[PDB]
């Protein structure tokens, strides 16, 4: 099959600002009948893959200009003029010159913003979690930009990295920031047998890190 | 215009066979255009799998020939995937699409898993809080397989809401989702998460109450 | 649709 290579994997760029990507292809795409099937395809957050550009350059139904397509044999390169929010998401170039049609790896755009430091807030395992005999504890990171973090887990003052779960939000378009849950999962009874229960989040937002803590014999 | 929509069994065991539905709204499969599957692996990695054109003709991936068939049915306008001797590899979203012949259009995308484990109800635990605003969680844990719904009052609450994809620690999935809101809106006014897991047929609405 | 090649 056809091998698609696209770069770079990663884009951060302010909106207004110009954005693109390269697509190199194995061997090339150009067809007998004298045409290069090359094709742009965009993947949104929470959306269906829709279509962006077919034959190198043509632009699909209800795509604005600020797309474009270039290149031939293979080397291609898809440039957006003028950068928005909606146009966050992943993208994948694709060949249909030869058979099984083939796709690229993706090319994630980022809409870079000003700096933004994180909401933290720490829950201890619910009542009725534990009156079930579970404990688990959840710290939430919400609308923070950069993407760059640390977050540790510290009960009775002890790092923890055995039973994080950490998951990420992808970036919203309404706001351009991230959030990211972080869960730790204990037993009813190891939760009693420990008193302090920390999350700290480390972000260039804060010279010093941002603390949540909670003390069982408190609560 | 032209409406797809994939349907099909969310859970099939391996050395089984995976067999999904695309019905099409609005033209006839039959007029024109190919139809495709194309399948996204977790990682995000696309694969066409093959299509079905207006006439009946299919044309397959060859690392799937031997595996796949595509049919359809033109009284009900729909056509089918059928994708036989499937391994947890073949665990990942499917599409159907359609293109002339080359897709242009793609539908929702429906997931599908191949594995042995079995259909596991999820827990669903409310995470109340210890600024101005205040931020609740709903936890929803030790679940299979994918994918749960999950809406804070029952969808009339959708601002400040930040949903989590699931995470699978050991054989068993675990979710949660965060809803920000001013810090003088809860609790005078009451908020509720609903979990809705179609697999196990379970339905949840817990309400988000204070802590003592 | 414009017609390719496969079509």
């Known amino acids: 099959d056809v091998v698609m290579t696209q770069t770079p994997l990663s884009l951060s760029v302010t909106i207004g600002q110009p954005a693109s990507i390269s697509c190199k292809s194995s061997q090339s795409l150009l067809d007998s009948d004298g045409k290069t099937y090359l094709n742009w395809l965009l993947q949104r957050p929470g959306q269906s893959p829709k279509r962006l550009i077919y034959l190198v350059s043509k632009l699909a139904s209800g795509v604005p200009d600020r797309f474009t397509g270039s290149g031939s044999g293979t080397d291609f390169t898809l440039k957006i003029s003028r950068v928005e929010a909606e146009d966050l998401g992943v993208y994948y170039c694709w060949q249909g010159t030869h058979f099984p049609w083939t796709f690229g790896g993706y090319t994630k755009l980022e809409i870079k913003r000003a700096d933004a430091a994180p909401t933290v807030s720490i829950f201890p395992p619910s009542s009725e979690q534990l009156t079930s005999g579970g404990a688990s504890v959840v710290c939430f990171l919400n609308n923070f930009y950069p993407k760059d973090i640390n977050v540790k887990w510290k009960i009775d003052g002890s790092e923890r990295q055995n039973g994080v779960l950490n998951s990420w939000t992808d970036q919203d378009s309404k706001d351009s920031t991230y959030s990211m849950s972080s869960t730790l999962t204990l037993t009813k009874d190891e939760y009693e047998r420990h008193n302090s229960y920390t999350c700290e989040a480390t972000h260039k937002t804060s010279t010093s890190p941002i603390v949540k803590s909670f003390n069982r014999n408190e609560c | 215009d032209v409406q797809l929509q994939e349907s099909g069994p969310g859970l099939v065991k391996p050395s089984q066979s995976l067999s999904l539905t695309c019905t099409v709204t609005?033209?006839?499969?039959?007029?024109?255009?190919?139809w495709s599957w194309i399948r996204q692996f977790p990682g995000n990695k696309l694969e066409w799998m093959g299509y079905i054109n207006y006439s009946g003709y299919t044309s397959y991936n060859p690392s799937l020939k031997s595996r796949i068939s595509i049919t359809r049915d033109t009284s009900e306008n729909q056509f089918f995937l059928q994708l036989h001797s499937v391994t947890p590899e073949d665990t990942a979203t499917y599409f159907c699409?359609?293109?002339?012949?080359?897709?242009?259009?793609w539908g929702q995308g429906t997931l599908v898993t191949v594995s042995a484990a079995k259909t596991t109800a999820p827990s669903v635990y409310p995470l109340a809080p210890v600024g101005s605003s205040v931020t609740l969680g709903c936890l929803v844990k030790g679940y299979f397989p994918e994918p749960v719904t999950l809406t804070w009052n029952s969808g009339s609450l959708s601002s400040g809401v930040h949903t989590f994809p699931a995470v699978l620690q050991s054989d068993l999935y675990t979710l949660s989702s965060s809803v920000t809101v001013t810090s003088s809106t809860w609790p005078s006014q009451s908020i509720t998460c609903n979990v809705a897991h179609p697999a196990s047929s379970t339905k949840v609405d817990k309400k988000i109450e204070p802590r003592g | 649709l414009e017609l390719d090649k496969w079509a």
């Open positions: 609005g033209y006839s499969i039959t007029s024109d255009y190919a």
């Open positions: 699409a359609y293109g002339n012949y080359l897709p242009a259009y």
